[PDB]
Every structure is written in structure tokens, then in C-alpha cells.
Design an enzyme around this catalytic site. Structure first.
Site, PDB file in Angstrom:
ATOM      1  N   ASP A 470      -7.007 -13.492 -16.502  1.00  0.00           N
ATOM      2  CA  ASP A 470      -5.503 -15.171 -16.334  1.00  0.00           C
ATOM      3  C   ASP A 470      -5.924 -15.343 -15.069  1.00  0.00           C
ATOM      4  O   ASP A 470      -5.840 -14.902 -13.718  1.00  0.00           O
ATOM      5  CB  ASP A 470      -4.909 -15.131 -17.071  1.00  0.00           C
ATOM      6  CG  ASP A 470      -3.513 -16.791 -17.308  1.00  0.00           C
ATOM      7  OD1 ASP A 470      -4.632 -17.731 -16.762  1.00  0.00           O
ATOM      8  OD2 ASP A 470      -2.920 -16.775 -17.795  1.00  0.00           O
ATOM      9  N   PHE A 565       3.964 -45.175  -3.901  1.00  0.00           N
ATOM     10  CA  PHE A 565       2.940 -44.810  -5.133  1.00  0.00           C
ATOM     11  C   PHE A 565       2.462 -45.107  -6.295  1.00  0.00           C
ATOM     12  O   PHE A 565       3.352 -44.783  -7.218  1.00  0.00           O
ATOM     13  CB  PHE A 565       2.464 -44.006  -5.018  1.00  0.00           C
ATOM     14  CG  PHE A 565       1.781 -42.526  -5.101  1.00  0.00           C
ATOM     15  CD1 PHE A 565       0.058 -42.392  -4.484  1.00  0.00           C
ATOM     16  CD2 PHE A 565       1.194 -42.026  -7.093  1.00  0.00           C
ATOM     17  CE1 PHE A 565      -0.582 -42.025  -4.972  1.00  0.00           C
ATOM     18  CE2 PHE A 565       0.284 -41.519  -6.813  1.00  0.00           C
ATOM     19  CZ  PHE A 565      -0.607 -41.667  -6.046  1.00  0.00           C
ATOM     20  N   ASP A 792       0.524 -14.230 -17.869  1.00  0.00           N
ATOM     21  CA  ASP A 792       1.728 -14.204 -17.954  1.00  0.00           C
ATOM     22  C   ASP A 792       1.742 -15.368 -18.741  1.00  0.00           C
ATOM     23  O   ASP A 792       4.024 -15.694 -18.880  1.00  0.00           O
ATOM     24  CB  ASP A 792       2.105 -14.592 -16.478  1.00  0.00           C
ATOM     25  CG  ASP A 792       1.653 -15.970 -15.841  1.00  0.00           C
ATOM     26  OD1 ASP A 792       0.537 -16.545 -16.695  1.00  0.00           O
ATOM     27  OD2 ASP A 792       2.488 -16.048 -14.498  1.00  0.00           O
TER      28      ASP A 792
END
Ligand code: BEF
Ligand SMILES: [Mg+2]
Length: 1090
Positions: A470, A565, A792
Site C-alpha cells: 500500500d 479562498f 494500514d
């Protein structure tokens, strides 16, 4: 009659329990017992024996199959007002059948029947007469007005608490009996208890009782250890924390377990060791979530509200409307409170209000974990080994019985001899040896903080072929870090040149500190975008309470007015003030700033496209001098380029070495990630998974029609593809280019004829869903390879469960773990989180580094080698002992107790020392053997046995030539010092030495024999004793060992025979190991230049 209605169930039959006398086995057996009592009032006792046996067997018949249990105990009824249990027939791909208790409770004057099967709540709806699981409002097609017009729950919500339950993730663990039942079935335990019964049938009782106590204690300790491991690691870290919930028209603070669908909550900036409670929709406000755990992508997204959408006709789509949903199990790095006034007051905190949609095991993460737990799914080598040994014992017993009948002994002693042979067919030190091996392997793994819950998978790690990986969280961190400026030059001598820091002019270091949104409160803190904090700290700026910040090492700075923003036209702005002059800084995406500033450099596009095509996320910033309130457009009229800001997740300093060690050891390591193709390809090429040029399968156009396109990282080569017309041209694709398949392309190639020929040549899979990693691992296991998974996150839980050996890398440094252990000891660096990936993976490396894979493989090699050598040595010793008994015992050969014990102690010392060995540090390209039943090992065993038998027959014929044969012999006489006893005992010692000295030595997989001090000393002592007793070097010890003197010619013949036996056994074992070893890596493991 009940009928559960869900996609899990297939059929359902109610059950009502039957009385004790109604059980089938008890009533009928009484006529047979009465008949037996009448016939009784010798040969008849075996009838009572078999009757009791059949009765006890019928008593325990239900426990194996649940359908048989329902057939025996309960009877089928068709009225739910009385049934007390219900048999749930599941669909073929959803777990297994079960018996669940129908529960009842009265609420508001009306009882409510319900049960719960696989954490999925059912309830009795009278109008439909079915058990219907709850259905949510977001599941159907809802009007967005139905969500915008919510005002929280009111009244007494005691029926919702029953319809939906609590928002709790409680995983059940097995008990002691259900865990020991699995150990009480293996053939080793059954054979042990059967042998104990056979032995106690004629021998003493106290020794048998002690042995049975030992056998029980071993299994008790093993099950307790496994149960402790399970109870520790089989859970997800979920701690409730107080949140403000709008109930009864007031902001009241509940817990996290007391959340229900359609409840208004107020989510704030998620602190550590915590995450978003459950699936929420953002009713008002904004946020910046981090989906790196649930989704697998590194960049933090920007969620928005839902109020600006028309509430009349539009539908909550989860398509275009995916910028408002917040899943459960993700961190919120920043949250913005609502701007304008609504019907309800704004929350007391600074958070944004949202609407719960799903709770419990119905959310996304909960559903993944539930399907992993419940909807989930040889040991024939030991059986064939027992069959082999029993065949040899049967031949031995047949011969000894024929000889005892021909001699004229009674049947009882012959039966006792047969029982002795069948009992000694296996040494008693086998179970203790297996237990010591398992515990030594576990205590060797637990030195690197690697904890295992299925100890039978450690031998699986010895012949691993494919090592999947991964990307986010395993190989790289999941937080963006600063890298350095760019584009601040006018020379164009190189593109990828990163000025780290302390090298930019005053303009850039003033703009990076002037165009920002961080603020310090009155109590003292800093809130805002964490990457902005990281860059403002790396540049070396210090923000103060007032918007003006200073202490940058150069001077002071003040912010007059700042801008926000925006979602569209993504960029920022600020109007700062300096002691020298005034300027306005702008920082936003470069594609929007480029069309805004006047002076366009010559390397703008080159640098931007070079840094955006490999993972990194640039942010071009610009400035402008402004002479002495003002709008935003005239501020951004014309600007001046200053530089870039490049961020990316950094590699672990352990990934490169681990992947190199796996590459130089005949392993094929691939990558399965959820990030975009560019970042995955860049990280794989930097680590060492791909070497040359790489192609990518992704959608060619935009809309539809499933037409893929082979395209380089750059825009050089573009080879089209059609999953219904074209076929994989191996010659021009696979021999010249590495490739990497995305998720859309892997989904469009379903049902293709060459999908497996493709999967044999791809090393990187990017943008795959949590349900395609399982498909890939299942395909790689159907191809015949042995797989491994190391991740994980929550998206690869099914992949971890499906692989042959799965590893879950937690967080935590070595020094942090040492400090935590020291503090725990004294009481008796952030903490570690258990997460959802440690529930499925058997192994769980409590550290973060990737070397856990290497250490686990290095331990699996050693465990497999030890198992093979122990099997071989046991087989040889058992065959030799069976022959010794059968043939020798039929002659007048027997030894005193002294010699027997003196030799047996050293034999046991060596046998115990066999297991203790240390694996080498370097991983080798040759792999151990899988199982004992093959050509090489079986041939070597049979040949060593043949050599030993030939030597023994030769010495027996020689001795019978020397001394008379004495045809009349008896087996009841006591020990007498003779020549045959010595001439046989010496060869016995020599054979028991050679069977270790020839078959133990494994160099590539563990350290040499000389490094094993115990077994080496034992063999040296035994061979020295034998060689000193043969030539009679010390007459005192010979007279103390009851060995008669012999002539010189016989001693010479015996010594030569010993030497020839040892050397011939060694030579033929080496012959077989040299001719038919066959330790070859798979075809996918070879690495050829392209
Ligand atoms: F990017 Be991995 F799938 F966690
Ligand atoms: Mg991950």
C-alpha cells in the site's frame, strides 16, 4: 409464520423448543436397555460398551452441524407469537447459517419482537408479517429540501433508539470453549488421547493421569495465549467524546454513542486520537477533511455547505453533490463556522453544523468491517505422516504376532507387545517440541514488536512469491511536507532545482509571510491550514496576537486587509504593510495566476508541468507594489512572479532498503494504491518497483463507452485500446515498457480473455476501490502464487484478510515504545492507534518501519526449515525403533538400565538442542521445501533406512558366525552380559548419531552446526563414548558399563562397519540432495531487462 426479508437471508423457519424427554436419543434407548437387562438376567459386556458409546455419540451429534441441531432440539412452528428461536438460511456468499434468539420487550403498551443477525437489526412489522431491517432516508432518493428543513429531534425518542440502535462499534470475541474446540480436533491431540487410553487399558493409572494432565495443560496454555492476543488486538479504537447536539430547541452536549440519523450536530476541528463520528452531510459551513485512512488519497479535500442549492426540485445526488458529504473515520483539519443567519442559532463553538445520515455498522467504514468479519469464508501432511507410521507399525505388529504364535506364547502378552509398538510409533517429546517451537518463534518475533494471533501462518512466510504493498501510510507518510521553492531564477539552466530556504530574496520571504490566513487568539494558539503552518514555520515566521507578524529574522510586517479562498477561481490575496513600502501578495493555483500577472517568464510552464506530473502540489505566488478599502479585481490587476511552493508526502527512510532486499531475494513486489496514477508511478519508480519507462491504462475520452488508452507519463506515446476488439500485443507492449493499470481500466476489462496475461505483467495498480484489492488478491491466489499484503488503512481490510499472510503497520517509534514501556513498568511522542486494519491482519507490527516484512519472512524461513528437519528426524528414528523392536526383541538381546539411561540422556539433550537455532542475516534466493511428502525427502529417508538395515544385518550375520546361534531362545530372561549386546549397542549409538549429523545441516537458511553448542557437544560426547567403548580405550569404564571384552578382529570389523555406515548414509543423502533438490523461484519472480 415469520419470513425475514433481506439480501443476506435465503429462507427462515421458526423454532419452538422441545422438552427434555422430547429429544430423540433419550426415549428410544430405554427399550434397548430393558432388552439388555432382560438378556443379562463375557461376550455380552462388549454389547453394553458399544451401546453406551452409541448413546454418547448420538448425544453429541448436534454440535457439529447447526441444521442437525435445529432438527433435534427444536420443532418448526408457524406462529411468531410463540417461537423462541429462528433458523436463518443465509445467501451463498454471506457467512453461514445460524440460530438466533427471538427477543421481546414491551414499550408504550405494545411489545416489539426483534432479533439481531450479523450485527444487522431486525424487527417484527405486523402489517407485513416480516422481519425488516431499518431503511434510511439517504438510501432512497431524497429531496434536498427534506435535508435543508431539518431542526433536530424533539419529544421522547424511545422508538428511534429501538429502530436504529446506538452508534457503537462493538466487535465480539470468541470464548474459551469455542476456541479450545478447534484445538480438540487436530489429529495430533486425538492420537495422543487415543494412545493414552490404549496405554492405560493395561498399564498403570497414575502415570497415565499425569500424562493426561500435562496434555490438558499444554492446550490450556496455548488457548489462553491466543485468547489474550485476540482480546488485545481484535478491536477498533473508538472513544466517545462530547459533542454539541441540537435537541429540543437548545444546544445540549451529548456523547458520541447517543447519535441518531437526522440529528443536528456541530463538528469542530478534530483533535488527535479522534475522527468524525459517523456519516454526516454538511448543512452549513465548510471544512478541510483528510480522507487518507478511508479513501487512500493524500491531498486534503475542501468540503462545502449545501444551503446555496435550490431546495424545491433538486435531488441529493451524491454525484455533483459529493462536495458536502463527510464520511466517518476521517480527520477534519479545519472547519469554518456559518456565515449568515439561519433559523437556528449558530453553535456555541466555532464549528459548522451538519446532519447525521447513518450510524453504527451501517456507515461505510462500519459496513466494510462488518462484511470483513461475518461475510468471510490443508493439514493433510500430518495425516499422511501418521498413516505412514501406522502402516509400518502394522507390518511390525503382524510380524511380531506371527512370531509369537509360532513360538507359543499367550495371546495377552502378544496384544501387549502390539500395543507397545503402536504406542512407541511416535516419541513422547513431539507435542512439547512443537509447543517450544511455536513459542520460540513467537518470542523471536515479539522482539521487534510484531504480534501474531494465528501462529500457524508463520510457516506460510517461507515461500512467498508476490509481495503486495500500500502506498499512503505504508511506504509514505500521509501528511504533506514542504520541499522548497522553485522558478525563482532567470538562467533556465535546470528545471528541478529546489532552493530549500535562506536563499530567497526579500520579496519572496515577505510574500510567503504576508499572504496567509493564520491568526493567534487572545489565549495563545495558532489555527488554520496545517500545510500553511508548516511552510510559515519552515520559512521562519512568527505570528503574533494582532494580525501583524514579525520576528522573521529580517523585520516586522502588518496585514491591513486579507481575502478568502474561493471555491471557484481558486486563489487567495492579502494587502500587507511594511516599514519600507506597501505591497499586495497573491497566492493561488498557477493555472489561474498565470493569466493574471503581466510578465510571463520563460520557464513558467516547463517548471509547473515538470513538478505537477510527479506527485507534488505546487502553489505559485506573486506580488505587486501598491501605493496608498479596495476591491479584489484591481488588486489582482497585474502581478510579479516570485516562486513556487512544492509539497509532497515523504518516503520512509526504510522503504528503499527493504524493497532492494526483497528484489535481491527472488521476490516480486507490487503496489496497490488508491492515489492518482502519477503519484503512484513516481513513488514506485523512486522506491524501485519499476525501472524503465512506464505506461498507464486509463480512460481515453471523458464520457463513456469504455475505451482505454496506453499513455506515457509525458505526452510522447499514446496507444489506443478497445476491450472488445483489440488484444494485448505482447511483443511491443510487455517487452519494452512497464505498465500500470488504473481502476477504471481494470473494471472495463472484466470478462476479457487475456486479463490474467495482463495481471502477469503489471506491477502498479492506482485508483482501485476497496472491493478490487480483494479481487486482485483472489486472482493472484487462483493463479497459484502465494501472496502477502502490508497496509494500514480501512480500504484494504478485505485484502489483508484474504492474503496468505497479512501485516498491519501501526504508528510509533522505537524510543517512544521504550519510554511507554518504562512508564508502564514504573506505574505497575504520540500514542499508537489500533485502527480497523489490525482487526483483520493476523500480524500487527506495532512499529511503523517496513522492515517488519523482512523480519517476518526471515523468521518464516527458519520455522519452515525446523519443521521439515523435525519431521525427517522423527520419521527416521521411528522406523529404526520399529525395526529394532520387531527383529531384535525376537532375539535374546537386551541392555541394562545404566547404559540405556546414560545414552538416552545425551540423546534427549541433542534432540532438544535441535530446535534451538538462529537464522542468518542475509536473505537467500533459494527457498525451503514445502512439506515432507515429495521425491527428494522420501527417497533420502528410505535410503538411509535401507543403509542402516543392511549394516545391522551384516553385523548380526558376522556375530552369528563368531558365536553360536542358539535356536532355542526365550524373551522372559533377564539381562546378561554377552557379545551380541555390545556389538548391537555400539551400532545403535552410531546410527542415532548419524541420523542427526547427516540430516541436520542447513547452511543457507540458518547458522552452521558448529554454532549450535548444545547439539554439537551432545553428538561429540556420544560418538566419543561409542568410539572409546568400541576399541576399549578405558577398561574401567567398560567394566563399569557391563561390556564384555572382545577379540581384535571383531573390533576392527565393527569399527570399519561403523565408518562405512556413516559415510554411506551421508553420501547417499548428499546424492539425492544434489540430484533432485529443485528449489526454484516462480516465473513472476525473475527480473529481465527491457
Ligand atoms: F494507499 Be493505500 F491503499 F493505503
Ligand atoms: Mg494506507
Amino acid at each position: 409464520k415469520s419470513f425475514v426479508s433481506s439480501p443476506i437471508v435465503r429462507d427462515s423457519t421458526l423454532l419452538v423448543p422441545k422438552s427434555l424427554i422430547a429429544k430423540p436419543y433419550v426415549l428410544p434407548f430405554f427399550p434397548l436397555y430393558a432388552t439388555f437387562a432382560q438378556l443379562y438376567f463375557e461376550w455380552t459386556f462388549v454389547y453394553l460398551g458399544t451401546l453406551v458409546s452409541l448413546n454418547i455419540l448420538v448425544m453429541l451429534m448436534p454440535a457439529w452441524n447447526v441444521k442437525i441441531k435445529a432438527k433435534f432440539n427444536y420443532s418448526t412452528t408457524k406462529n411468531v407469537n410463540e417461537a423462541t428461536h429462528i433458523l436463518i438460511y443465509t445467501t451463498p456468499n454471506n457467512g453461514s447459517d445460524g440460530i438466533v434468539e427471538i427477543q421481546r420487550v414491551t414499550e408504550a403498551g405494545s411489545l416489539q419482537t426483534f432479533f439481531q443477525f450479523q450485527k444487522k437489526r431486525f424487527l417484527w412489522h405486523e402489517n407485513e408479517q416480516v422481519f425488516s431491517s431499518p431503511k434510511f432516508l439517504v438510501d432512497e432518493s431524497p429531496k434536498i429540501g427534506d435535508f435543508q428543513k431539518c431542526k433536530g429531534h424533539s419529544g421522547d425518542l424511545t422508538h428511534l433508539k429501538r429502530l436504529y440502535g446506538e452508534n457503537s462499534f462493538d466487535i465480539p470475541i470468541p470464548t474459551f470453549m469455542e476456541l479450545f474446540k478447534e484445538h480438540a480436533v487436530a489429529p495430533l491431540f486425538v492420537f495422543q488421547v487415543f494412545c493414552v487410553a490404549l496405554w492405560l487399558l493395561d498399564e498403570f493409572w497414575y502415570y497415565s493421569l499425569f500424562n493426561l494432565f500435562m496434555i490438558i495443560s499444554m492446550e490450556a496454555a496455548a488457548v489462553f495465549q491466543r485468547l489474550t492476543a485476540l482480546k488485545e488486538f481484535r478491536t477498533m479504537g473508538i472513544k466517545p467524546y462530547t459533542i454539541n447536539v441540537f435537541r429540543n430547541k437548545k444546544w445540549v452536549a451529548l456523547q458520541t454513542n447517543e447519535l441518531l440519523p437526522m440529528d443536528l450536530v456541530s463538528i469542530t476541528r478534530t483533535a488527535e486520537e479522534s475522527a468524525i463520528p459517523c456519516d454526516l452531510i454538511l448543512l452549513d459551513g465548510s471544512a478541510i477533511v483528510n480522507e487518507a485512512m478511508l479513501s487512500g488519497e493524500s491531498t486534503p479535500l475542501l468540503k462545502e455547505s449545501i444551503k446555496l442549492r435550490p431546495s424545491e426540485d433538486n435531488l441529493q445526488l451524491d454525484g455533483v453533490d459529493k462536495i458536502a458529504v463527510l464520511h466517518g473515520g476521517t480527520k477534519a483539519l479545519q472547519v469554518t463556522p456559518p456565515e449568515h443567519k439561519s433559523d437556528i442559532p449558530p453553535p456555541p463553538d466555532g464549528g459548522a453544523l451538519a446532519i447525521v445520515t447513518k450510524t453504527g455498522f451501517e456507515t461505510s467504514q462500519g459496513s466494510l468491517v462488518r462484511v470483513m468479519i461475518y461475510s468471510a469464508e490443508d493439514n493433510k501432511e500430518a495425516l499422511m505422516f501418521i498413516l505412514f507410521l501406522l502402516i509400518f507399525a502394522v507390518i511390525a505388529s503382524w510380524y511380531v504376532w506371527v512370531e509369537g504364535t509360532k513360538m507359543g506364547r499367550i495371546q495377552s502378552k502378544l496384544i501387549l507387545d502390539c500395543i507397545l509398538i503402536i504406542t512407541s510409533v511416535v516419541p513422547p517429546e513431539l507435542p512439547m517440541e512443537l509447543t517450544m517451537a511455536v513459542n520460540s518463534s513467537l518470542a523471536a518475533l515479539a522482539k521487534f514488536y510484531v504480534y501474531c494471533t494465528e501462529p500457524f501462518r508463520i510457516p506460510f512466510a517461507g515461500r512467498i512469491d508476490v509481495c503486495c504493498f500500500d502506498k499512503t501510510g505504508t511506504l509514505t507518510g500521509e501528511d504533506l511536507v514542504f520541499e522548497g521553492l522553485a522558478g525563482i531564477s532567470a538562467d533556465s539552466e535546470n528545471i528541478r532545482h529546489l532552493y530549500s530556504a535562506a536563499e530567497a530574496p526579500e520579496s519572496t520571504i515577505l510574500v510567503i509571510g504576508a499572504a496567509h490566513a493564520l491568526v493567534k487568539l487572545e489565549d495563545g494558539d495558532i489555527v488554520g491550514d496545517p500545510m500553511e503552518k508548516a511552510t510559515l514555520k519552515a520559512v521562519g515566521w512568527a505570528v503574533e496576537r494582532k494580525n501583524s507578524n514579525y520576528r522573521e529574522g529580517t523585520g516586522k510586517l502588518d496585514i491591513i486587509r486579507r481575502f478568502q479562498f474561493s471555491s471557484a477561481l481558486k486563489r487567495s490575496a492579502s494587502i500587507a504593510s511594511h516599514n519600507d513600502a506597501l505591497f499586495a501578495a497573491v497566492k493561488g493555483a498557477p493555472e489561474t495566476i498565470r493569466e493574471r500577472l503581466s510578465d510571463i517568464p520563460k520557464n513558467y510552464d516547463e517548471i509547473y508541468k515538470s513538478f505537477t506530473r510527479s506527485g507534488s502540489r505546487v502553489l505559485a505566488l506573486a506580488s505587486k507594489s501598491l501605493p496608498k478599502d479596495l476591491n479584489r479585481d484591481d488588486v489582482e490587476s497585474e502581478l510579479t512572479f516570485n516562486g513556487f511552493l512544492i509539497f509532497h508526502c515523504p518516503l520512509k527512510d526504510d522503504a528503499i532498503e527493504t524493497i532492494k532486499m526483497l528484489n535481491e531475494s527472488s521476490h516480486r513486489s507490487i503496489m496497490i494504491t488508491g492515489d492518482n496514477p502519477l503519484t503512484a508511478v513516481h513513488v514506485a519508480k523512486e522506491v524501485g518497483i519499476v525501472f524503465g519507462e512506464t505506461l498507464i491504462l486509463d480512460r481515453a475520452g471523458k464520457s463513456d463507452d469504455n475505451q482505454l488508452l496506453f499513455r506515457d507519463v509525458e505526452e510522447t506515446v499514446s496507444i489506443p485500446f478497445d476491450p472488445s476488439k483489440d488484444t494485448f500485443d505482447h511483443s511491443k507492449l510487455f517487452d519494452r515498457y512497464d505498465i500500470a493499470v488504473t481502476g477504471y481500466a481494470l473494471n472495463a476489462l472484466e470478462g476479457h480473455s487475456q486479463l490474467r496475461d495482463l495481471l502477469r505483467h503489471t506491477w502498479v495498480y492506482a485508483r482501485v476501490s476497496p472491493s478490487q484489492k480483494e479481487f486482485l488478491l483472489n486472482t493472484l491466489k487462483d493463479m497459484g502464487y502465494q501472496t502477502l499484503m502490508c497496509g494500514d488503512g480501512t480500504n484494504d481490510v478485505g485484502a489483508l484478510k484474504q492474503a496468505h499472510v497479512g501485516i498491519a503497520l501501526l504508528n510509533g517509534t522505537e524510543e517512544g515504545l521504550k519510554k511507554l514501556g518504562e512508564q508502564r513498568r514504573l506505574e505497575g511522542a504520540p500514542a499508537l492507534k489500533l485502527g480497523d486494519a489490525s482487526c483483520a491482519a493476523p500480524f500487527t507490527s506495532k512499529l511503523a518501519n517496513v522492515s517488519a516484512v523482512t523480519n517476518i519472512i526471515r523468521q518464516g524461513r527458519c520455522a519452515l526449515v525446523n519443521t521439515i528437519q523435525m519431521y525427517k528426524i522423527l520419521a527416521l528414528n521411528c522406523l529404526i525403533s520399529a525395526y529394532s523392536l520387531s527383529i531384535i526383541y525376537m532375539a535374546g538381546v537386551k541392555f541394562g538400565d545404566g547404559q540405556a539411561t546414560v545414552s538416552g540422556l545425551l540423546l534427549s539433550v541433542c534432540f532438544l538442542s535441535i530446535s534451538r537455532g538462529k537464522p542468518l542475516e542475509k536473505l537467500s534466493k533459494q527457498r525451503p521445501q514445502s512439506g515432507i511428502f515429495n521425491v527428494y525427502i522420501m527417497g533420502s529417508i528410505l535410503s538411509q533406512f535401507a543403509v542402516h538395515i543392511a549394516t545391522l544385518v551384516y553385523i548380526t550375520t558376522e556375530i552369528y558366525k563368531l558365536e553360536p546361534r542358539e535356536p532355542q531362545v526365550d524373551l522372559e530372561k533377564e539381562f546378561a552380559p554377552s557379545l551380541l549386546n555390545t556389538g548391537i549397542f555400539i551400532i545403535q549409538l552410531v546410527q542415532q548419531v548419524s541420523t542427526f549429523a547427516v540430516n541436520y545441516q542447513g547452511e543457507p537458511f540458518r547458522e552452521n552446526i558448529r554454532s549450535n553448542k548444545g547439539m554439537y557437544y551432545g553428538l561429540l560426547g556420544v560418538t566419543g563414548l561409542a568410539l572409546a567403548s568400541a576399541t576399549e580405550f578405558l577398561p574401567e569404564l567398560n567394566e563399569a558399563m557391563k561390556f564384555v571384552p572382545m577379540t581384535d578382529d571383531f573390533k576392527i570389523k565393527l569399527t570399519l562397519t561403523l565408518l562405512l555406515d556413516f559415510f554411506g548414509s551421508w553420501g547417499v543423502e548428499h546424492f539425492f540432495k544434489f540430484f533432485f533438490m529443485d528449489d526454484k523461484p516462480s516465473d513472476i519472480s525473475v527480473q529481465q531487462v527491457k
